[PDB]
Design a protein around this ligand. Structure first.
Ligand SMILES: CCCCCCCC(=O)OC[C@H](COP(=O)(O)O[C@@H]1[C@H](O)[C@H](OP(=O)(O)O)[C@@H](O)[C@H](OP(=O)(O)O)[C@H]1O)OC(=O)CCCCCCC
Ligand SMILES: CCCCCCCC(=O)OC[C@H](COP(=O)(O)O[C@@H]1[C@H](O)[C@H](OP(=O)(O)O)[C@@H](O)[C@H](OP(=O)(O)O)[C@H]1O)OC(=O)CCCCCCC
Ligand SMILES: CCCCCCCC(=O)OC[C@H](COP(=O)(O)O[C@@H]1[C@H](O)[C@H](OP(=O)(O)O)[C@@H](O)[C@H](OP(=O)(O)O)[C@H]1O)OC(=O)CCCCCCC
Ligand SMILES: CCCCCCCC(=O)OC[C@H](COP(=O)(O)O[C@@H]1[C@H](O)[C@H](OP(=O)(O)O)[C@@H](O)[C@H](OP(=O)(O)O)[C@H]1O)OC(=O)CCCCCCC
Ligand SMILES: CCCCCCCC
Ligand SMILES: CCCCCCCC
Ligand SMILES: CCCCCCCC
Ligand SMILES: CCCCCCCC
Ligand SMILES: CCCCCCCC
Lengths: 455, 455, 455, 455
């Protein structure tokens, strides 16, 4: 039994020396790295085509329908007078009606299809306002029934000029319409073009009632297969990836079963879950997981190519994660040699103490996150949301973007002095505590763990 | 006595094992974290509403009243010819008079109310100039009585076109007026809208007499309750926070009193203030402070909701600081376990030596701050004020924004060669000394303290 | 023999003390540093002249031929309506025909010379479109023969107004023409001006068929000697550099041969390639390589000055690399003194373990590179290409540009939520793993190697 | 003698305990810190006034005289057609002639005064071109006599419209004129306004002959006292600073002389320059130097206030350096206590080895500097000059601005592939070598020196 247990833990070269076993798993891992990376790149081609089509069409729509729009002005684009708002709305509708004659793209109109469009209508121009809206700031009085009423005009593609906005109680104005187009660029990749429907929403937002009405344009893209198109090997490569991953999965499962049987035999011999897991090859669990991910991604990719699916983002995430895991999994074979296994050995020795340290660090980090989000968020562009606050604080710990973070608050030193002083204390204390004390101890734990396994 | 002293320092689990004592303080701390964080977020809703109203109205005013204004031009917006200045002033007054017909917001005029407005006047257009201003650069002569004289025209809301500026002795021009509006967006938060009065000041500043007159717009917002408004549970949550913090305060005070009595008993037994403080639970002092802060913030928040107060910034600071302290205070219960107490133990061992080191470092840092502020401030945008200089130097020590700091002075290499050379020496010496020597020793002190408590 | 072997490894001062040998190699190295650096600067003069001529002419062309172009708009310059595209094309052609009357430069036309120009034609205006292009998004149909057909109009320098674009199947439009000019600024450097031919290509790109057609201008510069020009010592310096490098090469070769003979004698005496290489002076191999590079660069520079060559970039790379190597090569003489040889000794002790560590780190780095390139590239401006991804990740490891990397993805939190979440996981995991664990161990290896050679 | 030698090295408290000596030097140092800092701030007031006047006038001139100028366009402002250049030149001259009627500042004209102005002339409009300029790119020929000829038109303040530019051989065009103004803002600081003469030079530069002519405006300011001005305590503070610094200088000189006498006595007793310098108080040499600097700066400041001098920059440098040295000099009294003297002790132990390390590092750094400056300078905005290259590399070593440095070269990956590849190798090798190996050893030396003096 001792001989078999010793053999179970021998390196591939040692196993070959002992029993002459050939290292098929290693060759399979190398082949998998190659083929999976190539497959990821080949998929990225079509993924890029789709993403580019969507974004370029959206930019073209912004230039066509938003009056006076220029690149880079999305965050500040707004109207400030009644005349500006009327001109913007009428320009959008007029451009919609003039699209066939002026546009560089070829678009088809969509009619009906439920709310907000009536039958035969292509464009819906709807204004939303309070049901009762008497507002008298001169007398410091108001009488509001805040139930929202929607009044919407229908425009058929080739009376909206009579639009009368209820400015004092206006909640917002929206323009909805759909356009159909064809993604011809797919031909460059030897693929059949798809049929895109863009749902375009233009919003003039007055929910702040502040005298400034921001204007935005958004799109939703729906991809469908076209009807009987005419155009005057990746599938084999996908099948090859499938076969390679299936064989790797089978071999890893066989190894895991053998390890489980050996574990049972050893436990019986001794007549301790931590000692039990010494027979579990975590690398092979990772390999099996990566193989499942790769096969799922390949099936999804084939379905997308066959026009049965259009979930490009899910496929890309699956294939990219599988590629990263496939590259990582080859480190299993450097673990047998000490001089090539410093990183994994240090990880193994250091992880527990690092987690125990993080237990204490996390409460402080979260307290700072919440405090900054709520107190500074209204004044600081980097504290608008909780995820943004976490990104800002994490970057600060790494010494990144410090001065601009300080400078964003310099504008408040005259307006809100107390908030400025609080921001000074907040930023200085956080930076000092986390850079010079928390991170120092984190690195000290890691390097001490390294010192433990050095020899 | 020895048994009681030993019990006083036992961990909550150990105390429960000994006497069966239930850990009510721990559950209270967890509940407090939850409820205080939720309360902070709920307050942040209305705080954001108020801040957004103020800033959005100010931006709308800049777009309405400043001729040719565009976003991002605040720091350079200026006039350069007499015609430009006259056009800007007349545009501001004309827009003020046209506001009801053009603006997207609904504003009411304010009349009278003391200086600078006379009775019945809504807008004050005042120019300030030297009492005697004979200036003759051709003969290199001047005769100045620099007492400032203010001549101000009054405009009633729906003769200012006869304004004649004394350019050669003009100190500045100002336009003052007030507008009333209602913050309707509060309805979205189930709150009654408040009545805002904006005091708008437009400044055309000629104090430099340099041929360039910068133009700025500032606002002051005063919030008041409206008279008999009509609109067709947070209070219980605030009460819950109050009760939780009061109970925590009572328990912490009881523990502190018990510790004080035990301290007195021990001192009597021995028949040393540093040894005396071993009976003071600093965590409980922090908890009591945080409870006082939370109760004060909650009372202020309730008063604001009842329309008795409008100090949003003070309330936000109180509640955010209390939230951070509440999150921090839970570390008291990790202090009993060595593997979870690395940070606090290292802090305790390291703080004195770090303070002694800072004693020496501070004089050098302040010398650099003053030197840079006065010598480079006129030439470097990052050295304009003392707080700005401190932020810049602190960011440099952390390696942030170094190259742009160097590059701002590259424009002086042709104009002011000596100042450029001095800036080179200043920056290089500061960066080298503080990054490679001061900070190295700081981190060395902290990690040596860690090494002392490692085992 | 032992005496001779000991002498072979003595320092220059020790060798002078023993045999009175003069250190000609050291003086040669100092002289080489001086002369090679001076030569590099003198070459940089003319290299700068050439590069500046090319870039300034290209900018002038962009301002002359692109309608409505402004500096900084290269990456967004595009047309969005048919009228805009026609106006841009006609403006380019009209400016080409008006060049002699409006331009600040003096340009000559080029006619004929093969495709795309016919005999006598100076400008080629060609549109490329699908051979069969029936596109019917209304019926979700298309019939495409995607073979590209080029129809191109010829314009002679002083019918193109009848251009009719086939928008629905348009692949792109191009304008090709060549201009001749003379680089007069060379006179300031006491050099004969060269004759430049600029090949200008203007592209209106519709390969995306997205309704947005980007517009770009590119140039290729060909330098030729002019015919019998009239204009009413660097060569000696180049010869001096040649002689210095040749003498250094001869001395280094002599030393290497002597070392080889001593190695053979020692091997014979002992009656081990690693022990063999102890007789190889790597510094002298570096010196010989640098001398070859310097002589090659000097010959290329002389050829360029004589107008036989125009490969400025190759010459600059050769001379700059040789200058860096010449500066580095003087460290050979600090190796004899321990207190001046810390860097090289640590390098020698540390390189093997660092390479073994990199073996493991590289697979993880490459997995991350591929995953990020394919998954985030379509959404993140910093992940567009593989080299860009490597630059971004390498900068992140050094803590640079972290927050903007996070912020570029905040625009996707609303559009593509899943891709945003994946980017969060990707960035956080990469930064943590590589900054706090991989780099820590890298630095630990280097400083441990230093500790080994410290005394 | 041993008692006296022991006393000479006792701390101020120890000296007071022994002989009752009062610590006048310490109180003097504190008083000096206070008064010198206050004096620096008070001077900074007037220094800021002068600098602001100059810069604001220059900006106003750019807006007045440069046609179509806008803020932030200095680096790209240029003409591209003959019509643009003529319009710019005529606009500048017309604005000069219209200044009294349009400008917001009050300016006086200056006439005559030597070249380039003739007697009675206020504006000089001069074009410079080659003496013989036959240029024929069509025939690839030219005949150049490159001697520069200047033809200059004189305009008297209230024929230049007949300007005919020789475009094909034009070297440049310049406009020179002078304006007198008075810095009235000084009144706010209770100072008599000075009389400024601005020498304005507008350059239209065609030295590249590239079809793009950049346009720039520069000013030189000369300050003179005005003649018999009329306007309807800092001097005592300066005198106080003088007295304090003189007394400190006297005491430091007395201490240095006493130390010298004790050194002579000890040397005589022993019957070694390094041992000799143990009697030299370097802190007192620093104090004497700082006192000399402060007195010189104070005298210069008084002279400036009396209108005898106008060298604001020299005075500011003197006073700022003296302030920094005065703040630093107080560390002399923390050297007696070990826990407060870590920084200086580590400096003393570490400086020699650090210098020996820098001996080797400097040659590599300089090689990289020269290589980058000459090879990448024409392509990279951060490598234009040698000082800029040093700043860029120094910032890179500190991990600052890495990604933008990489990204500036991404534009060359298509144009100049070889230069892009070289830049990749250059940047990667420099960053790796200097961040991970050179800086690691630098910090290791410093922390090892700290370890030597730790106990
Ligand atoms: C008897 C049990 C049930 C039936 C099992 C049938 C198994 C079968 O046939 O092969 C297994 C090997 C495994 O190949 P591979 O996985 O590379 O190699 C195995 C591993 O080295 C394993 O150790 P770990 O790597 O540490 O887990 C070791 O214990 C096994 O020997 P051992 O059994 O003496 O302990 C090896 O056979 O793989 C082939 O031989 C090529 C297959 C593909 C050929 C076509 C490729 C296109
Ligand atoms: C006799 C002295 C005067 C009267 C004192 C009356 C006190 C009373 O009634 O309770 C005290 C406990 C304290 O609860 P709590 O603070 O969680 O627990 C105490 C602490 O563990 C303390 O140690 P430190 O934590 O290290 O300071 C320990 O010394 C006390 O036992 P000891 O006295 O034997 O030393 C404990 O009782 O709290 C409740 O029992 C629940 C109260 C809220 C219930 C309703 C919740 C909604
Ligand atoms: C006999 C073998 C064949 C013929 C060899 C003829 C050689 C000849 O003539 O000179 C060699 C020396 C070398 O000068 P240089 O290279 O500076 O000096 C040699 C090196 O120091 C070498 O050690 P490493 O530096 O560690 O390799 C050492 O072993 C040699 O001594 P050794 O000979 O006893 O072994 C030295 O001669 O250089 C001149 O003497 C000036 C030449 C230029 C003068 C004009 C300048 C404008
Ligand atoms: C006999 C030799 C020639 C004549 C010397 C006349 C000197 C005189 O009068 O005072 C010297 C002291 C020095 O004051 P101060 O410099 O603060 O103190 C001296 C230092 O502590 C010195 O040691 P270091 O600091 O290490 O160099 C020490 O050796 C001297 O005593 P010692 O001589 O026994 O060794 C001290 O007198 O300063 C005043 O007493 C106040 C003066 C200003 C009062 C007005 C202030 C507005
Ligand atoms: C040998 C199994 C333990 C290490 C886990 C490997 C997967 C990261
Ligand atoms: C146990 C009291 C000493 C530690 C103080 C805790 C508050 C930060
Ligand atoms: C040193 C023990 C008491 C510390 C109390 C400070 C709490 C903020
Ligand atoms: C003495 C030869 C070994 C060191 C190599 C030097 C070249 C980098
Ligand atoms: C005591 C003299 C040696 C230290 C020099 C102090 C000046 C920096």
């Amino acid at each position: 039994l001792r001989r078999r247990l010793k053999y179970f833990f021998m390196s591939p070269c040692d196993k070959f020396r002992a029993k002459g076993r050939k290292p098929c798993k290693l060759m399979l891992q190398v082949v998998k790295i190659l083929v999976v990376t190539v497959q990821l790149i080949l998929f990225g081609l079509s993924n890029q085509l789709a993403v580019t089509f969507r974004e370029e069409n959206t930019i073209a729509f912004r230039h066509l329908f938003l009056l006076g729009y220029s690149d880079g002005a999305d965050d500040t684009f707004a109207a400030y007078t009644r005349e500006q708002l009327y001109q913007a709305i009428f320009h959008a509708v007029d451009q919609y009606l003039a699209l066939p004659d002026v546009s560089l793209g070829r678009y088809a109109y969509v009619r009906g299809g439920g709310d907000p469009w009536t039958n035969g209508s292509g464009l819906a121009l709807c204004q939303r306002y309070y049901h009762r809206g008497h507002v008298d700031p001169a007398n410091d009085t108001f009488d509001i029934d805040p139930m929202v009423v929607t009044d919407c005009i229908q425009v058929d593609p080739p009376s909206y000029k009579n639009l009368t906005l209820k400015f004092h109680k206006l909640v917002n104005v929206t323009i909805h319409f759909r356009l159909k187009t064809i993604n011809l660029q797919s031909l460059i990749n030897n693929e059949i073009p798809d049929c895109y429907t863009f749902s375009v929403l233009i919003t003039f937002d007055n929910k702040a009632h502040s005298g400034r009405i921001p204007i935005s344009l958004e799109t939703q893209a729906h991809i469908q297969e076209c009807k009987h198109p005419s155009v005057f090997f990746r599938l084999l490569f996908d099948v090859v990836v499938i076969l390679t991953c299936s064989l790797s999965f089978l071999l890893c499962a066989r190894s895991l079963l053998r390890g489980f049987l050996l574990q049972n035999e050893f436990v019986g011999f001794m007549w301790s879950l931590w000692e039990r897991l010494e027979f579990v090859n975590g690398w092979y669990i990772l390999l099996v997981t990566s193989d499942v991910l790769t096969i799922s991604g390949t099936i999804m990719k084939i379905g997308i190519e066959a026009k049965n699916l259009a979930s490009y983002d899910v496929c890309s995430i699956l294939l990219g994660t599988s590629t990263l895991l496939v590259w990582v999994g080859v480190i299993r074979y450097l673990t047998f040699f000490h001089n090539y296994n410093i990183l994994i050995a240090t990880l193994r020795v250091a992880l527990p103490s690092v987690m125990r340290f993080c237990c204490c660090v996390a409460v402080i980090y979260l307290g700072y996150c919440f405090c900054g989000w709520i107190v500074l968020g209204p004044y600081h562009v980097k504290f608008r949301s909780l995820s943004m606050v976490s990104e800002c604080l994490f970057s600060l710990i790494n010494g990144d973007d410090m001065f601009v973070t300080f400078a964003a608050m310099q504008a408040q030193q005259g307006r809100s002095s107390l908030v400025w002083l609080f921001s000074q204390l907040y930023l200085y204390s956080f930076i000092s505590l986390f850079i010079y004390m928390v991170l120092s101890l984190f690195i000290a734990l890691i390097t001490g763990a390294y010192d433990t396994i050095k020899h």
